[PDB]
Every structure is written in structure tokens, then in C-alpha cells.
Enzyme design. Structure first.
Site, PDB file in Angstrom:
ATOM      1  CE1 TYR A 272      28.193-112.918  24.718  1.00 60.79           C
ATOM      2  CE2 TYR A 272      26.446-111.740  23.773  1.00 60.79           C
ATOM      3  CZ  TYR A 272      27.185-112.848  23.783  1.00 60.79           C
ATOM      4  OH  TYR A 272      27.008-113.917  22.930  1.00 60.79           O
ATOM      5  CE1 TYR A 495      26.685-111.473  18.539  1.00 64.11           C
ATOM      6  CE2 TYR A 495      26.364-113.854  18.552  1.00 64.11           C
ATOM      7  CZ  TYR A 495      26.441-112.635  19.216  1.00 64.11           C
ATOM      8  OH  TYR A 495      26.260-112.530  20.589  1.00 64.11           O
ATOM      9  CG  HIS A 496      30.021-115.303  17.784  1.00 66.89           C
ATOM     10  ND1 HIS A 496      29.139-116.354  17.904  1.00 66.89           N
ATOM     11  CD2 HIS A 496      29.893-114.565  18.912  1.00 66.89           C
ATOM     12  CE1 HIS A 496      28.521-116.276  19.064  1.00 66.89           C
ATOM     13  NE2 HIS A 496      28.974-115.206  19.698  1.00 66.89           N
ATOM     14  CG  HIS A 581      31.027-111.148  21.612  1.00 70.68           C
ATOM     15  ND1 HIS A 581      31.962-112.118  21.867  1.00 70.68           N
ATOM     16  CD2 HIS A 581      29.827-111.779  21.607  1.00 70.68           C
ATOM     17  CE1 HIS A 581      31.362-113.293  22.007  1.00 70.68           C
ATOM     18  NE2 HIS A 581      30.068-113.097  21.921  1.00 70.68           N
TER      19      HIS A 581
HETATM   20 CU   LIG Z   1      28.345-114.377  21.399  1.00 72.41          CU
END
Ligand SMILES: [Cu+2]
Length: 639
Positions: A272, A495-496, A581
Site C-alpha cells: 500500500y 474500495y479496490h 487503491h
Molecule cells: Cu486493498
């Protein structure tokens, strides 16, 4: 799992038609409500006629159709699984127009979905273009069609959503392959999950915008599960994918040869993190405590020519940490990094504190003030976005995000940061009156005209949940300092999810989920076509063409001359993008000063500062006086 976006249409009075059906496997077995019966095309005694195979539904009345689902045969036999496919809708049964969805379904027995923007129709047609393993037959145990509660025609002038591209994976990361024009996507060790990974493998998928073909393939040569990585296109035109589920690995994607190449291991294991290409073509990275341990991860730099990672321990991560409630696991994630002048990297957020990072010697970091305006100091904005829409003037638009990674309210805060020299505090002001809709996990791209397209996300960030979704995208127009709502879409992209600018000037927006057994996996993407591609009647406008360029590879400071087929007023270079992300440190835009040589010949200079004109691949767009862009010509910028 996955899910339709509408509710099942009662099939009581439907009339179905198939191109062929085996006795005992009748066309109408696919709508009888029995999981153990199924339609199947001719085999054996009837011959084995190859695809295309077609299943047409007459629903007898007009429905507000927004999807279909296909349950494959449930007897452990794989014959007839649908691979490549198209979905068409008709109000009369004879004019089918173009597909509302197309692409490829993954090769297994799970229920498959096609979700698309609501369209009134009486007839639905599914075309199986290939069988999932190349065999000749098609089979379906249950076919359903779904409807929305209502239908609203798109408003004129606010762009259009569609078609849907059906995919065999959840595209939680993606990049444009600049030499081929294809969209490259990946998930994790399998199509829909990242937990329980064995490491060493990533499932990838590509979409070719010109052929519509979707394919998939595993990558194992670089021994890397590339879920949750840093992504940067380096100055050698290779995509550097770092860490994530295999937290120390580096993988290189080479567009020219369409292959993955092992890279050197990073000095520090990370997930991340953000990475950013520098003015000298090297790649800087910092932070990243999703994987590899929750310790302080200072900067390091990748050199494409020596194929090494070198630690920059004095490029300290501590000044950019947010105050995240989950601590270090989150607080060093998804930095808003931009390569800038003389090897520097600007960190615009998500932390309130902005910083300059330096890559000479063993590294350095200097405070660049707080992200703020006359409205106050901006709070932490985790999973906000940041977009450099005018690199020549140092303009970055930032927007959205929330103080914590999860379980936190998103903001409408938006700011314009104007970069000058490294080590000076940039001026920051509020952008217009902020976003129309507070959102986090949203994605964004700069468009050829300098506006920023902002889409998806949710009002309160809850990974794996499609709660409080934001369906209305916005476009920021810098010359008017105004946001404009565009037509809404129907699929949650939180998300994603990812967004990329395509070489044809449309936006590819996809993904969301990647949470295994959840029902919120989106095995798809949708195209958004901006209003600049339409005429006043709502038809696609005629586009100017770039008929010749003087070079396809240029040094910073170098000049290019082009020929067009018509007059052009404006031109821009947009660096090719990479996305995961909410992070896209590769896109940026340079507005070009055109000079007219007569005879539809125009010249321009690539900026001489490689901190502005970051080396790598760029899209050249030209716009006529009506504001319609060409498709992009690909230019490699070197230094
Ligand atoms: Cu993720």
C-alpha cells in the site's frame, strides 16, 4: 460471489429462442427455475456446431433492463461454459444496435453477471462468442434478466456511460500498455480474493479497446502476488510494480514485448505504499505498512539502468504520517506523490502536512506547509485523490478522502496546490466550493482539455461494503474554477476500484470488491464518454486526425511537428496512467503551445525540465475549435 444491480424479472410468459438445442436440453430449460435442467446446443448425433451460439428472450413487454445472469450447468461437467460474449437489447426484436455489455467470463461453474446502465427493452439477446475452454457447445442452467425500479434518460451535455466490459477478474489494479493501447489489469493470486495467498502468482487480464477482446493469463515468472502494490512507469518505459502480497518483490512490465521481467527486491518490504517516477527516470517509494511489518519505512530509490534499489534513510516517512485511528498499519499508505524538479518528489497528502522529498545523497525531507485555505487547515484525507492537471504551472487538484482509512466520513474538501521550486511552501487555495458529493475510495483522471473527471467512491469508507455509494461523477473545469455533475452510473465503484484515461479519450472505470465470498465483487468495468466527444444533437462528433508526427520519441526540450487532416486550436500531452487503491502517480498533463506552420502543420516543444515532462510514455491529443479531441498519438519522452 457477485450480484445483479437490479431485481429478477418474472419469466412466466417469456418466449425464448436458441440457435440450436439438444433434445432434453431445450431452450426453455434455461428458464424453468430448476438448477438441474439446462439448455445445451447440438452435440453428438446432431453434430457439434461451433460458436457463436445465441439465446434470445422475448419478455412480451418493455422492462427497464439493467442486467442478466447466467448460472452454468451444475452437474460437474464443464462443457458449454460461456467465455467471450455480447449482450444486446431491442425494443422491436429486429434492430439490436450495439452490445450493452461484452467481454469474457472466468472459466468455472459460478454464476456470471452482466450489469449495465438501465435501458428499456422487450428483447434480450445473449451471444456466446466462445466457450470458456474453446470447445464447440454452449449451455445454461438458469438465465435471468434484471430490472431497475425506474428509468431516467441521460441528460444532454453530461456525457454517457456504457458499454460494460465483462471481465474474468476484479481489476483492482490496472495500467495502459502504451505501445499496444490495451488495458492491463490484475487482481491477486486468483480472480476475486487476496487472503490465503500462497504468494508467487498474480492473475492478470487485458482488454483491447479496438477489438473488444478480453483475455486472462497467470504471471509467475516474477514470483510476485502483485495485490496492494506501488506502481510507477520508469524512464525506461517499464512499469515498476513493488511489494503488496509479496512485500519485497519488484516486477517489471514491458509493454513493447508484452512481458513481465523480474526486478531486484526492494530494500524494505512494503504494501500500500505509493511510488513515483522522478525527473531522472528513477522510481522513489516511501511508507507502505499494509504488508512487510508495521515499522517505519523511509524512502528508497530504484535505478532502471543499474537494476538496483538503494535505501534513502534520511528521506524520513515520519513527517507524512496521518493520524489514522488504526496507527502505522494505515498512516503511511497511499501517499499523494508527484515527481518534480531536480530529483525531488512532492508529497501533497493524504496527511495535512505536505513535504518535499529529496533523492540526492542518503535522502532528505523538508516541510512544505499544511494543506489549507481561507476555510481552514485541511484534515487528513486518506484515499483522497490528487491530480496534476497542468504540470507546466505546477497545478495539482486534490479532493475527497477521510481522516481514517475506514469507518470515517468522507469530505467534500478540494484544494488547488501550485508548485514552484523544491523546498518552497506552495500556495494552496480551496477549489470552487468543494465537491458536490463527499467521497472516499473514488478515482479520477485528467482529461485532454485539462478538466479532471472524478468518479465513484462512497460517503463513508467501509471496505468490502457497497454502502453509501456515490453514483454521480463530477468534472472540475480549472478555467471556470467550477465543478459540474455528469450523468450518473448504476454500479458502485468504491474500495479496490480504478479509473484510467484511454488513448481514445474515454474513461475506463472498473473494479471494486476483491473480497472473496462477499457479494460486492465487480468483475467488470464501464466506459464513460465525456461530452467533448458528442455534437449538439447527442451523436458522436467528427474527430480531428493526426496524420503524421515527425518523431515518436523525443528528448525533453525537443520539438515535434505534426500534420493533421483539419484545423486544430489546442493540444496537450497526457502521461500514461497506472492505478490502484486511488493512487495514480503516473498521469499528469502538459498544455502545449502550438505554432502554425501552414498546411495543417503544427509544431510544439516538449518542456525542457524533466521534472515537469517526466520521462516515459505520453499521449498527444489535438482538439479542433469545437473542442473535439483526436485519439491519442503515442510519444515516448526521454531525458
Ligand atoms: Cu486493498
Amino acid at each position: 460471489a457477485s450480484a445483479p444491480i437490479g431485481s429478477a424479472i418474472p419469466r412466466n410468459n417469456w418466449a425464448v429462442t436458441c440457435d440450436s438445442a439438444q433434445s432434453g436440453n431445450e431452450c426453455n430449460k434455461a428458464i424453468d427455475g430448476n438448477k438441474d435442467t439446462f439448455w445445451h446446443t447440438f452435440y453428438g448425433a446432431n453434430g457439434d456446431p461451433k460458436p457463436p451460439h445465441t439465446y434470445t428472450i422475448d419478455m412480451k413487454t418493455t422492462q427497464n433492463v439493467n442486467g442478466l445472469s447466467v448460472l452454468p450447468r451444475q452437474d460437474g461437467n464443464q462443457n458449454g461454459w460461456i467465455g467471450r460474449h455480447e449482450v444486446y437489447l431491442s425494443s422491436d426484436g429486429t434492430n439490436w444496435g450495439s452490445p450493452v455489455a461484452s467481454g469474457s467470463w472466468f472459466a468455472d461453474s459460478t454464476t456470471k453477471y452482466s450489469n449495465f446502465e438501465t435501458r428499456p427493452a422487450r428483447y434480450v439477446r445473449l451471444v456466446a462468442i466462445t466457450e470458456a475452454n474453446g470447445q464447440p457447445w454452449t449451455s445454461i442452467a438458469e438465465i435471468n434478466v434484471f430490472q431497475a425500479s425506474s428509468y431516467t434518460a441521460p441528460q444532454p451535455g453530461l456525457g454517457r456511460w456504457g458499454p460494460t466490459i465483462d471481465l474474468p477478474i476484479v481489476p483492482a489494479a490496472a495500467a495502459i500498455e502504451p505501445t499496444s493501447g490495451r488495458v492491463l489489469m490484475w487482481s491477486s493470486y486468483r480472480n476475486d480474493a487476496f487472503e490465503g495467498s500462497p504468494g508467487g502468482i498474480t492473475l492478470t487480464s487485458s482488454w483491447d479497446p479496438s477489438t473488444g477482446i478480453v483475455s486472462d493469463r497467470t504471471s509467475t515468472v516474477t514470483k510476485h502476488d502483485m495485490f496492494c502494490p506501488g506502481i510507477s512507469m520508469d524512464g525506461n518505459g517499464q512499469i515498476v510494480v513493488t511489494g503488496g502480497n509479496d512485500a519485497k518483490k519488484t516486477s517489471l512490465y514491458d509493454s513493447s514485448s508484452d512481458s513481465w521481467i523480474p526486478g531486484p527486491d526492494m530494500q524494505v518490504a512494503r504494501g500500500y505504499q505509493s511510488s513515483a517516477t522522478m525527473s531522472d527516470g528513477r522510481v522513489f517509494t516511501i511508507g507502505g505498512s499494509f504488508s512487510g511489518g508495521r515499522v517505519e519505512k523511509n524512502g528508497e530509490v530504484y535505478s532502471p539502468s543499474s537494476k538496483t534499489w538503494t535505501s534513502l534513510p534520511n528521506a524520513k516517512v515520519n513527517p507524512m504520517l496521518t493520524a489514522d485511528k488504526q496507527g502505522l498499519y494505515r498512516s503511511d499508505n497511499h501517499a499523494w506523490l508527484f515527481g518534480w524538479k531536480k530529483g525531488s518528489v512532492f508529497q501533497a497528502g493524504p496527511s495535512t502536512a505536505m513535504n518535499w522529498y529529496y533523492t540526492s545523497g542518503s535522502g532528505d525531507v523538508k516541510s512544505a506547509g499544511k494543506r489549507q485555505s481561507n476555510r481552514g487547515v485541511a484534515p487528513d484525507a486518506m484515499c483522497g485523490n490528487a491530480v496534476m492537471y497542468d504540470a507546466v504551472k505546477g497545478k495539482i487538484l486534490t479532493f475527497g478522502g477521510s481522516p481514517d482509512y475506514e469507518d470515517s466520513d468522507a469530505t467534500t474538501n478540494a484544494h488547488i496546490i501550485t508548485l514552484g521550486e523544491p523546498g518552497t511552501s506552495p500556495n494552496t487555495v480551496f477549489a470552487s466550493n468543494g465537491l458536490y458529493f463527499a467521497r472516499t475510495f473514488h478515482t479520477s483522471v485528467v482529461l485532454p482539455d485539462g478538466s479532471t473527471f472524478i468518479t465513484g467512491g462512497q460517503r463513508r469508507g467501509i471496505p468490502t461494503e457497497d454502502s453509501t455509494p456515490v453514483f454521480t461523477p463530477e468534472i472540475y473545469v480549472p478555467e471556470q474554477d467550477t465543478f459540474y455533475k455528469q450523468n450518473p452510473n448504476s454500479i458502485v465503484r468504491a474500495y479496490h476500484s480504478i479509473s484510467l484515461l484511454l488513448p481514445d479519450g474515454r474513461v475506463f472505470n472498473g473494479g471494486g470488491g476483491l473480497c472473496g465470498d462477499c457479494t460486492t465483487n465487480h468483475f467488470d468495468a464501464q466506459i464513460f464518454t465525456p461530452n467533448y466527444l458528442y455534437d449538439s444533437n447527442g451523436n458522436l462528433a467528427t474527430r480531428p486526425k493526426i496524420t503524421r508526427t515527425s518523431t515518436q520519441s523525443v528528448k525533453v526540450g525537443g520539438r515535434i511537428t505534426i500534420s493533421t487532416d483539419s484545423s486544430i486550436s489546442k493540444a496537450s500531452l497526457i502521461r500514461y496512467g497506472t492505478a490502484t487503491h486511488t493512487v495514480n502517480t503516473d498521469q499528469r498533463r502538459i498544455p502545449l503551445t502550438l505554432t502554425n506552420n501552414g498546411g495543417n502543420s503544427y509544431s510544439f516543444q516538449v518542456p525542457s525540465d524533466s521534472g515537469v515532462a517526466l520521462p516515459g510514455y505520453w499521449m498527444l491529443f489535438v482538439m479542433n475549435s469545437a473542442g473535439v479531441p483526436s485519439v491519442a498519438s503515442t510519444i515516448r519522452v526521454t531525458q
